[PDB]
Design a protein around this ligand. Structure first.
Ligand SMILES: Cc1c(-c2c(-c3ccc(F)cc3)sc3ncnc(O[C@H](Cc4ccccc4OCc4cnccn4)C(=O)O)c23)ccc(OCCN2CCN(C)CC2)c1Cl
Ligand SMILES: OC[C@H]1O[C@H](O[C@H]2[C@H](O)[C@@H](O)[C@@H](O)O[C@@H]2CO)[C@H](O)[C@@H](O)[C@@H]1O
Ligand SMILES: [Cl-]
Length: 515
């Protein structure tokens, strides 16, 4: 599906895509290979959908956080630069694009949010979130507002949510069992935001465009944005500074740090062309300058050029915020985490849910994959061997234990009553190895995805997995069970995410079958 002898590149509409296209023309000069740069809407949602069918761009640009998802689904080429090239970029940038030990992208630039303030309105920007209300009242008396930023994307609100002890996945590797979305710190940050809105210091409908227009016209004294934004402010002749984000309850705002990264599509027939492009045209002083001059990249991964721009106090401020922040995890569940928190912030801001209701649903949504896997993996393995897993359930272990106990009753019942259809389907598929299992997964993915949503169909999906798992054990294919459990889990949580959260996840399963 992807055309050989050219390069199609996807990059977000806020990045320097005219600059990248100029690096594209220089490549075409040397090679006679045309480079098309596109910035489609939602490209971070479209890439996984199209790339799975062997379609999409040759190169996708996004922050590193989405790339583990892409790599796990087999959508990215392993990149293998030689030592001489690896040494040209900061090790910590390479770390951002490492997944299960393999480099899955080229790092381009380190991004963090800063407080951007209009020096003519606000000579001294506020050190604390707590002083922004009184600053707003002072500025409204003069026909201005204190602060506007994008309330539609949780990336911009996260630094406040995280300040007093909100976190996504705990680090001390990343404990995926430990989600800090509905703890006291997260509640405190989101409550402060909702109070700002309730008190008319901010408007819940403010998005990227409205904040940018209002700051760049000198109507609001402050915004929160990344380096990409600076170009448009330079154009506006607002006298702006870039500074440390305000503290909350005495603690730094903790922005989620992104490394803008360039991944090669696994389905691309143009991998050597993509590698030559990214290594020897883009990731050079001249290539990054071309992009940076269009929309600023931040602290670039390329040591030689980072040194040249390091003296810029806007970069200095970006790295001060990044140091108070945390590098985003690249784990496959990041997409689910962001979707959950996006919904929680929009709903709390709008009044559709209270902060407690919004962050509860977000915690459920963020924990959904790992919780579902634990139940589904334990059911298939204990069905297959006749022996339960001794290891303790961990956090939400009561939910997991009671869901496992319910599924034992209800799942054993479907395997007994539907033995005929299950044996029939198992006998048709000639399951004798991991290849046969992967093929089954593809079919079962289709049949489950295509049908209606209720606990019975969900039990049927998991119970068929149990039925198959018993087969795999008896034919010395036990190593195929975990990958089957991961397949079932993946399609369950991806295709029924909203319904599952609406039911309070596995608590709803336990209550629905309570007798
Ligand atoms: C495992 C399965 C599925 C199935 C998957 C499947 C299919 C093919 C594969 F290769 C692998 C997995 S993933 C999946 N996920 C959800 N539901 C599924 O099935 C149900 C229908 C169903 C079938 C059999 C037993 C029970 C049962 O539903 C009980 C139920 C339903 N709704 C509420 C409450 N209870 C459905 O789609 O609604 C499936 C679909 C049809 C099906 O059998 C259909 C009958 N066939 C006749 C011909 N024979 C050779 C074969 C049998 C079977 Cl065995
Ligand atoms: O809002 C959730 C969103 O946050 C990040 O996306 C940032 C991106 O890193 C920046 O490069 C810039 O474009 O703004 C985006 C926010 O609108 C995550 O990278 C992304 O995965 C996540 O969905
Ligand atoms: Cl409100």
């Amino acid at each position: 599906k992807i055309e050989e002898g050219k390069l199609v590149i996807w990059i977000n509409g806020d990045k320097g895509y005219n600059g990248l296209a100029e690096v594209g023309k220089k490549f075409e000069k040397d090679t006679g290979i045309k480079v098309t740069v596109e910035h489609p809407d939602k490209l971070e949602e479209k890439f996984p959908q199209v790339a799975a069918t062997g379609d999409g761009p040759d190169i996708i640009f996004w922050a590193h956080d989405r790339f583990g998802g892409y790599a796990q689904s087999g959508l990215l080429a392993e990149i293998t630069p030689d030592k001489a090239f690896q040494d040209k970029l900061y090790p910590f940038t390479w770390d951002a694009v490492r997944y299960n030990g393999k480099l899955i992208a080229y790092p381009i630039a380190v991004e963090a949010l800063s407080l951007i303030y209009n020096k003519d309105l606000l000579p001294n920007p506020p050190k604390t979130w707590e002083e922004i209300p009184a600053l707003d009242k002072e500025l409204k008396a003069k026909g201005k507002s204190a602060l506007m930023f994008n309330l539609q994307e949780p990336y911009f609100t996260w630094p406040l949510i995280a300040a007093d002890g909100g976190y996504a996945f705990k680090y001390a590797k990343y404990d995926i069992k430990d989600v800090g979305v509905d703890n006291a710190g997260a509640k405190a940050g989101l409550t402060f935001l909702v109070d700002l809105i309730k008190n008319k210091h901010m408007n819940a409908d403010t998005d990227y465009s409205i904040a940018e227009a209002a700051f760049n016209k000198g109507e609001t004294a402050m915004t929160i944005n990344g380096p990409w934004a600076w170009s448009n402010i330079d154009t506006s002749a607002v006298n702006y500074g870039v500074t440390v984000l305000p503290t909350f309850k005495g603690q730094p705002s903790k922005p989620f740090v992104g490394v803008l990264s360039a991944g090669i599509n696994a389905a691309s027939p143009n991998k050597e062309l993509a590698k030559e492009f990214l290594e020897n045209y883009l990731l050079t002083d001249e290539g990054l300058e071309a992009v940076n001059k269009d929309k600023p990249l931040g602290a670039v991964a390329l040591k030689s050029y980072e040194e040249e721009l390091a003296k810029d106090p806007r970069i200095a401020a970006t790295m001060e915020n990044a140091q108070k922040g945390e590098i985003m995890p690249n784990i496959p569940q990041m997409s689910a985490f962001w979707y959950a928190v996006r919904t929680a912030v929009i709903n709390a801001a709008s009044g559709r849910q209270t902060v407690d209701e919004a962050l509860k649903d977000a915690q459920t949504g963020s924990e959904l994959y790992r919780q579902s896997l634990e139940i589904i993996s334990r059911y298939l393995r204990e069905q297959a061997t006749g022996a339960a897993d001794t290891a303790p359930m961990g956090a939400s272990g009561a939910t997991s234990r009671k869901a496992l106990e319910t599924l034992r009753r209800v799942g054993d019942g479907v395997q007994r009553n539907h033995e005929t259809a299950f044996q029939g389907m198992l006998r048709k598929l000639d399951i004798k190895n991991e290849d046969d299992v992967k093929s089954l997964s593809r079919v079962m993915i289709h049949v489950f995805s295509d049908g209606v949503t209720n606990w019975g169909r969900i039990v049927t999906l998991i119970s068929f997995g149990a039925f198959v798992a018993k087969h795999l054990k008896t034919i010395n294919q036990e190593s195929c069970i975990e990958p089957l459990a991961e397949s079932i889990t993946d399609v369950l949580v991806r295709t029924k995410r909203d319904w599952l959260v609406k039911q309070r996840g596995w608590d709803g399963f336990v209550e629905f079958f309570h007798v």
